[PDB]
Amino acid sequence: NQYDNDVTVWSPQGRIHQIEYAMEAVKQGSATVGLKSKTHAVLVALKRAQSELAAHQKKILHVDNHIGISIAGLTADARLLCNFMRQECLDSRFVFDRPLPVSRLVSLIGSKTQIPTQRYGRRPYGVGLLIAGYDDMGPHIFQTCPSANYFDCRAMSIGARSQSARTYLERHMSEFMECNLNELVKHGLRALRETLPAEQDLTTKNVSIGIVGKDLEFTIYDDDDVSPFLEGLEE
Amino acid sequence: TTIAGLVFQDGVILGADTRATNDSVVADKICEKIHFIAPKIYCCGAGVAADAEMTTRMAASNMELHALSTGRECRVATVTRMLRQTLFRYQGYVGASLIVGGVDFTGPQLYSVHPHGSYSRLPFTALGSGQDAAIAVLEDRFQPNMTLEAAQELLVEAITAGILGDLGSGGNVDACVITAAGAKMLRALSSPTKPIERSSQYRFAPGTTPVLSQTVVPL
Amino acid sequence: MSRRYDSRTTIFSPEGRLYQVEYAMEAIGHAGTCLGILANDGVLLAAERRNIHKLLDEVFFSEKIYKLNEDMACSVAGITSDANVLTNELRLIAQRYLLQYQEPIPCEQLVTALCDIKQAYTQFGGKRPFGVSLLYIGWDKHYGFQLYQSDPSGNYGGWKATCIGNNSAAAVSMLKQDYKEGEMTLKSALALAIKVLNKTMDVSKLSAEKVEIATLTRENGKTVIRVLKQKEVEQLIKKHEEEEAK
Amino acid sequence: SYDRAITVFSPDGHLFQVEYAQEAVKKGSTAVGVRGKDIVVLGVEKKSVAKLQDERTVRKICALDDNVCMAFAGLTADARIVINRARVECQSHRLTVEDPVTVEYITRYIASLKQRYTQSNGRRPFGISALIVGFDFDGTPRLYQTDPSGTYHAWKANAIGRGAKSVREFLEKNYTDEAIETDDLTIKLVIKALLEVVQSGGKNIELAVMRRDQPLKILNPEEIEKYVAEIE
Amino acid sequence: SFSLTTFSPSGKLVQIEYALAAVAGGAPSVGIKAANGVVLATEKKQKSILYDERSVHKVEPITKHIGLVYSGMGPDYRVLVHRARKLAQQYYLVYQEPIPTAQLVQRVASVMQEYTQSGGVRPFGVSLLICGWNEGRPYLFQSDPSGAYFAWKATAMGKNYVNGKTFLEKRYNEDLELEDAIHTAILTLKESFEGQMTEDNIEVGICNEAGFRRLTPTEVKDYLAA
Amino acid sequence: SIMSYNGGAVMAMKGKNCVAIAADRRFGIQAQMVTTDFQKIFPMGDRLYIGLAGLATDVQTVAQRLKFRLNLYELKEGRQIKPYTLMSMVANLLYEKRFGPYYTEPVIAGLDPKTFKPFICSLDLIGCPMVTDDFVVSGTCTEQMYGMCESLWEPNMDPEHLFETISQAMLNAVDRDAVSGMGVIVHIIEKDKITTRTLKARMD
Amino acid sequence: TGYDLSASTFSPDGRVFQVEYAMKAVENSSTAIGIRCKDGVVFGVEKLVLSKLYEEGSNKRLFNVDRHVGMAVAGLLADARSLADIAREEASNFRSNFGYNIPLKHLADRVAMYVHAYTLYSAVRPFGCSFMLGSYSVNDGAQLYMIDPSGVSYGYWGCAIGKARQAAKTEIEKLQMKEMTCRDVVKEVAKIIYIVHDEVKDKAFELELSWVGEITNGRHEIVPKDVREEAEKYAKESLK
Amino acid sequence: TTIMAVEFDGGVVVGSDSRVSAGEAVVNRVFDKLSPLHQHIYCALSGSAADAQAIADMAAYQLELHGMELEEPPLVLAAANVVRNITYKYREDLSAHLMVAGWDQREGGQVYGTMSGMLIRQPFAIGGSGSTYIYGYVDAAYKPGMSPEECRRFTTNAIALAMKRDGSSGGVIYLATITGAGVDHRVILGDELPRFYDE
Amino acid sequence: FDRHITIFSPEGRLYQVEYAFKAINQGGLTSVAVRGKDCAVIVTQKKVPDKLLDSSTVTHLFKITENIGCVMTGMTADSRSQVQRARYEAANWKYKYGYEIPVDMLCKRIADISQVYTQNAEMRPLGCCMILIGIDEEQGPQVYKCDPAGYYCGFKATAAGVKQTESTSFLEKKVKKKFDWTFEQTVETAITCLSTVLSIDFKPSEIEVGVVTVENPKFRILTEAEIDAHLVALAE
């Protein structure tokens, strides 16, 4: 009714509906999934094309050698945080000559996300961010929210039709830690199967992935190297 | 330029001479020095001419604002914290030198302000170019809590010793007598120069000037 | 903040006009009746005083008539508060002109300078517009004797004769009928103001105290402005007093 | 300060504020202009004053420079700000570049202002549409029309203000190579372009002309009647 | 950051129209300019006998020769005291002379004009009577919430000003002594104010050749003989 | 210094009810002379004048800001400014720019706008107001102008004496100066009118 | 009525509804409790398990403001993480100025200044979380204060916040917490949370405890895994 | 220009000289250089007299605003930091040098040299152009664990020795002693100054 | 519309300011203060909802400066805000004018801060009334009360809260008798006032009593042990 106009107005139940609808816009778009083992972490992003003539949108944004992120939500809203996140990672190596820790970066990104919220007139960021990274303590999977909340997860699936995907992730979570880089991609791609209906399932064309590891810097694969990753797996 | 001040039992008195000079010649014979702030508080400046003038007038307006706003009469210790914070902000670049004193409900208080912004409380002081000549008589001949009329003639001897001593002190000598009951100003208090006359009388009749053009503007 | 209470003057009506400006012209019509006449020998200005009471004083030179500068003057009908704002801004623009060119500002230049400031608030800023309508008189080196009328929307224009405030439709109609273009001068045309001010005022027996008259004429290379003597204006009304009988 | 958006979108996509701005453009007086062969001619109707106004301030045909002049139809308020700040650009362009001003260069900077005023916070779109016309290098004339929205076009013959579409119907039908052949036929076309929207107006038509190297020249009322005398 | 004052369909200013409506709902105030001085009489009404009278005064001086009274919202008048006093000191800096009455009220009313224009600020709910003495000419001015200051030989405001003006249409004559003008203003407020009439409730002050001087309750008690 | 760059001088005196002002017309650059037609004295309106000397730029600059702020005071109040009040304006104007000071030595003389009452004064390069009821001299020849004035000055003299007095003052004084001379403008301020004469001096 | 549309608008009954809604937003948060005793101040937090996919230690509600100052929050999590950095930058500016650790009474007062500053205007909103600030020092001892959406400091011997509040506050009043020692406080803090939460809507949870006091040598420190599970086993005696 | 501070068990002792000298001609020969930062906290001015007085009031303000918020006197370490943070900030345009000493209900008597804008903790500190010649006397005479009277002995004698050699130091001594009880004041007149070897 | 923000009502009122007057009244605490000959006393209701709450952690008596005490009644959110802002002023007063701020100017500056809340529509009035006490060398004991509207005046006996209407009546009954002004016997009058209104006989921890005297210009808070002495032992 009259409580949905802006962020500052609180509902009589103590809820901000603009932040609530900010989480709704994240469910309105492509579903991405990511997971981490004791060594390697993989981010599986689902690329979607509006038509067959138009190509697939880019859901992966390269951050640094040790850090990468996938975006689910309003498309262009991630561009502002992208150039900011890249600038923060460069400033870390520009001063400390050291890559910024993964947990410290997300804490700084969650700060810039929360600042415009309480201040009237500034629109909250309506895109969700699934970011991964590797450090001396191993890989990390950090899922964020438009409310600026961010967690630490072994595996997480966000977006539309992520219900059956999360159920698959929970039962197989015990394997996600002990599997090697090859098996992480396999079960990671089969987790993306539940995010789409029974007609269109998965192809190497519309599905891209990225990986980070112990001695391996974050890389991005789209079609060529992804074809042997998908094939050889039962669904 | 030499100004002086002193503290007596019931109040303070600030002495000054009348002569202002452009550091080569005498600019004015009768030029006044002592300024006005409050009914119970008057001040006198020294050092740079205009820097002392504007500084006292800018502080005198804030005293009237504080007076009427509080409904209470002005305080003497309040004056200095206005002055120095304005002068110290300029870091002594302003050559204004001020000897400030007055009477409040607490009692007689006589301060002094150097161009760098320093302040000190004391019964008597003198500043200016010829200060050291006038400070001598003041430091030597002062007694604690002297009689009012005894301190008046003491100030007359003070600046008089600074007149012959310095090339910047001359003309007449006036003082400002401020008391706990009220304030008073004495003009033409000391007239050391008696030779103001003219020997030869010269009356130049019209026509001795080679007139060229003439025009008149009516009103 | 509370956009609920924001009137947004910059919004156009569905008829393609401004809300505040349209209501500003009506507020001017409620003000007193003021007229002006541009003649050969100079400019003529007369203004009614709608304030009538036995306790009034008016220690100033005039109520609705002000002096802009040496060579120019003005009248006012509208909100009395916003008039002092425009009067000060006219005195600022005219004197800042004297800095650069060291010459008196022409009549047309000073008028168009404030009208840009008037409508600047209707263009942006969110602040309410001005409800003041001003008449302009004076002399310049080129165009000479000039008479100008301004509008709250910022629009203006030259006028040989005009009227502002109450009774605008009746006065201007009565003005044109007997108005002599480039012919009837101060002396004669001064009788028209008294004749018009008596018709515009609904209360009969027009009083010299209820009206005010000021003229500006440059003579012998010097601009002369004065407020006419009420004792003489009474005799100037005594003329109109004997006009209906003879 | 005052910071908020003024012009916002609609469920059908059209702009409420901008359409009401162009509505006030049509509510103004009818102004016309054409691009002649060797010259340019502007004209605008005059609402008939009764034995009062002075024509110095009322004149709606101005000149931004010796090369380029302009006319406007709409609210007289916003017209004077554009004329002033465009003349500043004309002198600023000559200050920056020794070469004279270009009609296309000055025109775009004008309409660009109205685009800024539309998308700026707290500003307002103007209710004016101006015809920018002048001479380019080698003597090639150019006629451009502005828009409150900030776009600008090129026109061989143009009409603005009230009944702009009505006169445009007379334009497109009666504009041929026979039009704007000579300085006389160019002026007579501007008069006839003002004869459709005129109701018992008569002498109210005022005209202006710019001839080659010379700057904008105002035709005297008797010189106007000379070309108006021929109708039938 | 937006001005809430807009033009009514009749042309009136709605925010300022209700500004004077708050002024008329306050304590009555009157003034008279006669002979060599100007008198200002106000009525101070407390809510009980537990409030100190001499603590806060309605009549306040601005400069030596100028003083002001008010009827309306109390706190809104305290803002004008600081701005009027500070303006007079900025005057004394430039011209080194006491401020005239006409110059003061002009720029003081300009503060009223600014807050009826600049956004995010409500107009004032006060109306002030201006008393000043300059170059042998008595000055009695009346200011409103809109910022329009007029000239009055005598005036009434606050509550029951209609009956107050009626008294000034008769009781006020010319060549009237300042002392008789004070008792005349008391007769004007005789009908308005009811209950117990004391010297503490009424607050009177004057300005003359000697300057603006506020009257003490002891002196007022002698002026209550009528 | 820069005060001696353009040279020039301004002199003003007071009679009984009247005051007098005179100044040299010379305008030049250092040793080189340019033109003798320069005007160092500007009218301030009825019964008031102001002189200026020193750097010729600030003479044509500061004096232009006068009538700027003067008219604003003459438009708001329906009276002319007092010469005692005008002195505070110039002293305040020089102390807004005090930090990088203008170069000039103002001279103010006139009458009480109220009636006949005369008043005179002068200011300083740094803006210090100085009230002297006898005479004021300013310029590069200053030290030479003193002895002439103080010897021939008298408290009360009719306009007839003030004619020859300040004339003979200027003449012999300005002689010994290299950078001042070549024409003199004299202004005499009476109650009901104003007398302005031109003096014949050596061209040198 | 439209009187609740803004915090700058007062109710005709003289109330502020927007700030009251922020307190109702805290009522949606999970239950968190804290207790102070002679040895130090003991913290506890109920950590709800939304899904098994969360890593151990994720959704940490224990924030470290400074060396001697810990904090536990109940409300919107990001609003607490944003203010946590504000408190850290504030305590850092204190030591950079006066050269020592800010006391709890001084820090909780300046944070309340920032909390209430957002309740004053219409251009911002109040914090949707109510938090507790503990501290320990040899100069003071165990100290515990509480800040609310209105930005007011409340000292407590023991306290409860979150959804279930009044029920946990009464259980704390039934036993004197000042005589007991931090070693025995974590036993009761664990027993209370088991009594507070039952399985109706939420499924499972875990106990998050924090230590500040003499046992931690005057430094904010999380509970070790060995002692935490030991205190939970003693708390499982009430469950069995 | 001579200032001195000595630490002992219950508190500290701060001496000063009354001569304010600029050039070879004394400006003001009688002045009290002790400027209170607070009831229980004082400072010792040195260097340029005018520039040092401004820092004292700017410090006494920032300290007073922080004092009433906690309703307790700030730590002596907090006083030296405020003096240092103000000094080091403006130290390029201010040649003033200060000496901070005080007592608190926790640490006790402390002395922190702020000279030039640095910070140091010393049992005794000296400063000014007159203290340049007392480095020899302070080492042999000073011994720890002296009573306030025994400290004032070592304090007054070192200052009475200072003002003899220095031309810019002279006048009378102003003493301040802050203990748990309160503040004490002693003024040593020129004739009351202990006299040393003049030959 | 006029009932929400601060704008002039058609009757001349201000509803945003008046709804604040009900907000001070909404706090559920009644405060009284009486100005005596040699002293000024403040007695307010000290409420402790739960035993887990602590005494010294919640107090209604604040110190603006050493010689000026402050008591607050309303929603505590606005209580602490003004006191910090007042301490930014009273301290600033000494940095400029160099002496302890008088009670006259302290109430004037705090009012001006509250006057901007009413004039500026961006901000809101504060929901706590402020009663400032102190002493000066001329007028002696000073007692003022500043409303959120910005008005303040010298009050011989002032009251606030829900019982303010009944509290003012009993304060009039004591002054109507020309009650002899002495220090502790006046402290009774302020305590007996709240005691007779609510008909309770409060415990020593249920009230908070501040004091200021000519002998002690520094503000003091009466000890709860001394409160018990003058409640039980002297009810007379």
H50/B88 touch (CB, cutoff 8 Å), yes or no: yes
Cα–Cα distance for residue pair G172/D17, rounded to 1 Å: 64
- Token pair, residue F107, equals 């001279």
Q: Is H77 on the interface with G (CB under 8 A)?
A: yes
Of the candidates I110, I133, I170, I126, which has an alpha carbon nearest to the alpha carbon of residue I17?
A: I126
Q: Are C185 and C174 in contact (CB under 8 A)?
A: no
D149: chain C residues, CB-CB within 8 Å: none
Q: What is the largest CA-CA distance in chain E?
A: 54
Q: Which CATH number characterizes residue D227's domain?
A: 3.60.20.10
A148/G81 touch (CB, cutoff 8 Å), yes or no: yes
Pairing of strands A67-73, A60-62: antiparallel
Given E85, E92, E93, which is nearest B68 (Cβ)? Answer: E85
Of the candidates B49, B50, B48, B39, which has an alpha carbon nearest to the alpha carbon of residue B76?
A: B39
DSSP character at residue H184: E
- Single-letter amino acid, residue F192: D
Q: What is the signed CA dihedral for H16, H22, H24, H27, rounded to 10 degrees? A: -80
Of the candidates E90, F93, F85, which has an alpha carbon nearest to the alpha carbon of residue B58?
A: E90
Distances (CA, A) of F16 to B204, F24, F116: 17, 24, 10
Q: Is G94 on the interface with A (CB under 8 A)?
A: no
Taking CB atoms within 8 Å and a gap of at least 24, the contacts of D164-172 are D164/D26, D164/D30, D164/D73, D166/D196, D166/D197, D167/D30, D167/D32, D167/D193, D167/D194, D167/D196, D167/D197, D170/D196
Q: Is E95 on the interface with F (CB under 8 A)?
A: yes
Of the candidates H175, H151, H136, H152, which has an alpha carbon nearest to the alpha carbon of residue H3?
A: H175
Distances (CA, A) of H119 to F62, G100, H81: 53, 15, 8
I230: left (phi over 0), alpha (psi -120 to 50) or beta: alpha
Q: Is I202 helix (H, G, I), strand (E, B) or coil?
A: coil
Q: Are D145 and D153 in contact (CB under 8 A)?
A: yes
D180 inside domain: yes
H85: chain G residues, CB-CB within 8 Å: 97
Given E61, E62, E92, which is nearest B61 (Cβ)? Answer: E92
Q: What is the signed CA dihedral for E160, E165, E166, E168, rounded to 10 degrees? A: 130
Q: Is D3 helix (H, G, I), strand (E, B) or coil?
A: coil
Can you give the C-alpha Rg of chain H in angstroms? 16
Distance of residue F27 Cα from the nearest chain C Cα, in angstroms: 21
**C-alpha angle E95/E101/E106, rounded to 5°?**
90
Q: Is G97 on the interface with H (CB under 8 A)?
A: yes
Range of the domain at D153: 9-232
Q: Are C190 and C44 in contact (CB under 8 A)?
A: yes
Range of the domain at I195: 1-236
Cα–Cα distance for residue pair I197/I203, rounded to 1 Å: 15
Distance of residue C57 Cα from the nearest chain E Cα, in angstroms: 5
- Return the residue of I nearest to E55 by Cα: I154
Q: Is F168 on the interface with E (CB under 8 A)?
A: no
Q: Which residue has the tokens 């009469």?
A: B73
D52: chain C residues, CB-CB within 8 Å: 159-162, 176
Cα–Cα distance for residue pair E205/E222, rounded to 1 Å: 14
F197/B211 touch (CB, cutoff 8 Å), yes or no: yes
- Return the residue of C nearest to G7 by Cα: C2
Distances (CA, A) of F101 to B89, C230, C245, F50, F131: 19, 52, 73, 19, 21
Given I26, I58, I81, which is nearest G14 (Cβ)? Answer: I26
**Cβ-based neighbour number of residue B170 at 10 Å:** 22
Backbone angles phi, psi at G163, to 5 degrees: -55, -65
Q: Is E134 on the interface with F (CB under 8 A)?
A: no
Q: Are F194 and F188 in contact (CB under 8 A)?
A: yes
Q: Are I44 and I208 in contact (CB under 8 A)?
A: yes
Of the candidates F175, F197, F165, which has an alpha carbon nearest to the alpha carbon of residue F184?
A: F197
Range of the domain at B23: 1-219
Cα–Cα distance for residue pair G158/G44, rounded to 1 Å: 12
I7/E15 touch (CB, cutoff 8 Å), yes or no: yes
- Neighbouring residues of I185: CB distance < 8 A, sequence distance ≥ 6: none
I97/B105 touch (CB, cutoff 8 Å), yes or no: no
Domains of chain C by range and CATH?
Answer: 2-246 (3.60.20.10)
- Token pair, residue C50, equals 């709608």
Domains of chain E by range and CATH?
Answer: 1-226 (3.60.20.10)
Q: Is C29 on the interface with D (CB under 8 A)?
A: no
How far separated are the first and last CA of chain F, in Å rounded? 22
Q: Is C24 on the interface with E (CB under 8 A)?
A: yes
Of the candidates G38, G37, G58, G62, which has an alpha carbon nearest to the alpha carbon of residue G48?
A: G58
Q: Which residue has the tokens 């020592």?
A: G100
Burial of I113 (0-12, 13-18, 19+ CB in 10 A): middle
B68: chain E residues, CB-CB within 8 Å: 61-62, 85
**Cβ-based neighbour number of residue A58 at 10 Å:** 13
Cα D148 off chain centre by: 13
- Token pair, residue G179, equals 């005589």
Q: Which CATH number characterizes residue I60's domain?
A: 3.60.20.10
Taking CB atoms within 8 Å and a gap of at least 24, the contacts of F98-104 are F98/B50, F98/F126, F98/F127, F101/F125, F101/F126, F101/F127, F102/F55, F102/F58, F102/F61, F102/F62, F103/F2, F103/F3, F103/F54, F103/F55, F103/F57, F103/F58, F104/F52, F104/F53, F104/F54, F104/F55, F104/F58, F104/F59, F104/F62
Pairing of strands E37-43, E29-34: antiparallel
Q: Is I198 on the interface with E (CB under 8 A)?
A: no
Q: Are C31 and C50 in contact (CB under 8 A)?
A: yes
Cα–Cα distance for residue pair H81/H87, rounded to 1 Å: 10
Cα F147 off chain centre by: 18
H helical segments located in chain D = 16-27, 55-58, 76-96, 103-119, 164-174, 183-193, 221-228
D2 inside domain: no
B77/I99 touch (CB, cutoff 8 Å), yes or no: yes
D193 inside domain: yes
H helical segments located in G99-224 = 104-120, 166-173, 182-196
- State yes or no: chains G and F have 3 or more CB pairs below 8 A: no
Q: Report the residue of B75, B76, B81, B88 to disrupt the I interface, i.e. the one with the largest count of I CBs within 10 Å.
A: B81
Backbone angles phi, psi at H145, to 5 degrees: 70, 55
Of the candidates E205, E206, E69, E209, which has an alpha carbon nearest to the alpha carbon of residue E137?
A: E209
**Cβ-based neighbour number of residue F2 at 10 Å:** 10
Cα–Cα distance for residue pair A192/A166, rounded to 1 Å: 10
Q: How many domains does chain B have?
A: 1
Given B57, B58, B65, which is nearest E85 (Cβ)? Answer: B65
How far separated are the first and last CA of chain D, in Å rounded? 60
Q: Is B201 on the interface with F (CB under 8 A)?
A: no
Counting as contact any 3 or more CB pairs under 8 A, the partners of A are G
- Token pair, residue C198, equals 């008596």
Distance of residue I200 Cα from the nearest chain E Cα, in angstroms: 25
Enclosing H/E stretch for C227? strand C222-227
Identify whether H1 is a catalytic site residue. yes
